[PDB]
Homo-oligomer: A and B are copies of this chain.
Amino acid sequence: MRIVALDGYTLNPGDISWAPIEELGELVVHPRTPSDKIIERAAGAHVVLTNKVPLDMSALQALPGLRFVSVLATGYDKVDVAAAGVLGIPVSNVPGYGTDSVAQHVFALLLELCRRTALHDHRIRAGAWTQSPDWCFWDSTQEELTGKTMGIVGFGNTGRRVGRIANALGMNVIAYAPRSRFDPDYRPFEHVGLDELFTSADVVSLHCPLTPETEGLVDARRLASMRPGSYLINTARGPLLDERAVAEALDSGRLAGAGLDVLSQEPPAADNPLLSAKNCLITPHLAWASRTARRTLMDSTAANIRSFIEGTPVNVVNAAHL
């Protein structure tokens, strides 16, 4: 059995192992694949692995040998899985691999906005501690989370993890939980409508899929409803925000800070308003990417392939179309 990874570099840039996949067939790993080389490289493969390499109906029909696709992610927005279905190709993803990676990144962003440790380290190195008229200093107000309300938009695995951490930091937690009425074992906790979340939360973290209903959720109106000095964190999907309104909220002081691992355009423009905004922290879509999570992602991908071989495919995202 012949297996091809079209963009394996981000999953394994030399610090983990393909061994679990290599046990199941003949593997070829390309670090990335430009669009004009997709059919060439995928030709002859029984199984294709893709993270973000697109597979549309025209590519799928040009690969008659293709029997199974596994996506190296929870999201599969760049794979036309419906077209795969009608051609009789199951498509699997991996949910749950990065719950801890992502939830901890929400707090890495948030605490760096609150304390700005790296800034103060830089200032020490420029001699700011000697230059200071006091025994200590800070160029950025030090902010504590204790007693603030964490509002969690979307309450799947990652959202729930964010909530458990928030609780342990002494925050109140409120969740907009449309897909599930899940009650955690900690207080204070409460389910709220989306409107109520924005009026009551001091920190808002986004953990929902991008859909018609959630496009531009964080808009000028919901921002205006928030308490001044609030924080926004987004490790989910860029188009959940109106980027303009958020930049203006940062500059006005409505938002004391924003921590963003995703943007509507990746990579961003130099003149994207979020790159010129004060108190904005941005990371390059790496929240998912701890060595532990990628290791887990590798194993779960091997499990998906093993299951397809055994005749009972798991994590199928196009069951309705087969």
Q: In the complex the two chains form, is A100's CB within 8 Å of B141's CB?
A: no
Out of B109, B118, B123, B293, name the residue touching A144 (CB < 8 Å): B293
Q: In the complex the two chains form, is A147's CB within 8 Å of B107's CB?
A: no
Q: In the complex the two chains form, is A142's CB within 8 Å of B290's CB?
A: yes
Q: In the complex the two chains form, is A286's CB within 8 Å of B138's CB?
A: yes
> Within 8 Å of chain B (Cβ to Cβ): is A115?
yes
- Which interface class (under 10, 10 to 19, 20 to 34, 35 or more) fits A? 35 or more
Which residues of A pack against B, CB within 8 Å? Answer: 7, 9-10, 15, 32, 52, 100-101, 104-105, 107-109, 111-112, 114-121, 123-125, 127-130, 132-138, 141-147, 164-165, 167-170, 259, 266-268, 270, 275, 281-286, 289-293
Tell me the complex Cα distance, A68–B184, Å: 49
Out of B52, B107, B116, B266, name the residue touching A107 (CB < 8 Å): B107
Chain B hits for A285, CB < 8 A? 135-136
Chain B hits for A281, CB < 8 A? 117-118, 121
Tell me the complex Cα distance, A270–B125, Å: 8
How many copies, total? 2
Instruction: Give the 3 A-B CB pairs with smallest separation, nearest first.
Output: A168-B168, A118-B118, A144-B290
In the complex, the chain B residue whose C-beta lies closest to that of A34 is B133
Tell me the complex Cα distance, A168–B162, Å: 10
Q: In the complex the two chains form, is B134's CB within 8 Å of A100's CB?
A: no
Q: In the complex the two chains form, is B52's CB within 8 Å of A135's CB?
A: yes
16 A-B pairs (CB sep. < 8 Å): A15-B141, A100-B146, A104-B114, A108-B112, A108-B115, A108-B117, A112-B112, A112-B118, A116-B118, A123-B284, A130-B267, A137-B284, A137-B286, A138-B284, A146-B292, A165-B165
